[PDB]
């Protein structure tokens, strides 16, 4: 168990034991997507390191962390590569949904949204999820995968 202190919010508890499981929990109680969460040990103020166990950062049974919610709504450019292997550039926000990106790809490519699916680094993008959940970066390349019928 561990206490989480929202900044302008209040407090709540969660049980664990990685930093990635801590965020899944936080998300499973206040809905804030992992990619918008920033964490730090309370009251030390020391940022939580993403790639290290909680036990090695001074966190154990009944510790406290400060959750800071970052916007992450700053627009950015990514590539979407079509079936011919030709990419086009799209401006997006990590807060936009996959379905929204599909609408843009559809208008540019001339393919209806039910005739292609998108992937990023070997993960299919799920329509209802925010782009931010996939870790997209400026000039990241997404694949446009065609559904072929005949």
């Amino acid at each position: 168990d561990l206490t989480v202190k929202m900044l302008a919010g209040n407090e709540f508890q969660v049980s664990l034991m990685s930093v990635s499981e801590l965020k899944a929990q936080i998300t499973q109680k206040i809905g804030v997507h992992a990619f918008q969460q920033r964490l730090a040990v309370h009251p030390s103020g020391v940022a939580l390191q993403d790639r290290v166990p909680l036990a090695s950062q001074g966190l154990g049974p009944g510790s406290t962390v400060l959750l800071v919610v970052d916007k992450s709504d700053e627009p950015l450019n990514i590539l979407v590569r079509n079936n011919k292997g030709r990419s086009s550039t799209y401006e997006v926000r990590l807060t936009q949904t996959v379905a929204h990106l599909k609408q843009q790809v559809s208008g540019l490519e001339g393919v209806q949204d039910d005739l292609f699916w998108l992937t990023f680094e070997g993960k299919p993008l799920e329509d209802q999820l925010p782009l931010g959940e996939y870790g997209l970066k400026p000039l990241s390349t997404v694949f446009m995968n065609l559904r072929l019928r005949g």
Partner: protein, 164 residues
């Protein structure tokens, strides 16, 4: 066309077990196109043509039977199944109905079901390859090669003798 060409195709992984390539060549330089009936069953006809001995124009029934058991094992985990948007049972009820079109979704599941590699080669005009889409880990020499053309037709391909 050299043997060095078919041997050197570059496949890019899309997800585990699925690949894509954009070679530049004409189908008829390396393949024989085996034309299929042109009813709503050409996808299944093409598979049967390349996987069943003494193939006739009713062979495709075995392929569709294979696709049903495939669907039961794999449909729910397939990425195109969300494009389709039907429950496994609704999907099966449609897929098994006469002259219902086959697709990349059935090619994906069938590849798993029969442990084979299927490549669908797409051409926009003439026989000029636009893309190859590969389901499974085998190479072009061992694959079941299909041709998708005219936006809605599937034919079977066999590698010409001089390239094997």
């Amino acid at each position: 066309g050299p043997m060095d060409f078919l041997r050197s195709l570059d496949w890019t992984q899309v997800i585990a077990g699925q690949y894509v390539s954009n070679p530049r060549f004409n189908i008829s330089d390396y393949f024989e196109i085996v034309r299929q009936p042109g009813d709503g069953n050409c996808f299944y006809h093409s598979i049967a043509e390349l996987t069943m001995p003494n193939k006739t124009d009713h062979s495709y029934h075995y392929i569709k039977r294979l696709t049903e058991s495939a669907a039961r094992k794999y449909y729910q985990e397939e990425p195109e199944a969300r494009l389709v948007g039907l429950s496994l049972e609704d999907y099966l009820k449609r897929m098994l109905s006469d002259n219902e079109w086959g697709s990349t979704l059935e090619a994906s599941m069938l590849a798993k079901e029969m442990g084979i590699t299927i490549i669908i080669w797409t051409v926009a005009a003439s026989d000029e390859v636009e893309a190859g889409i590969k389901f499974g880990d085998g190479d072009v020499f061992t694959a079941v090669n299909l041709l998708h053309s005219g936006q809605t037709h599937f034919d079977a391909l066999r590698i010409l003798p001089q390239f094997e």
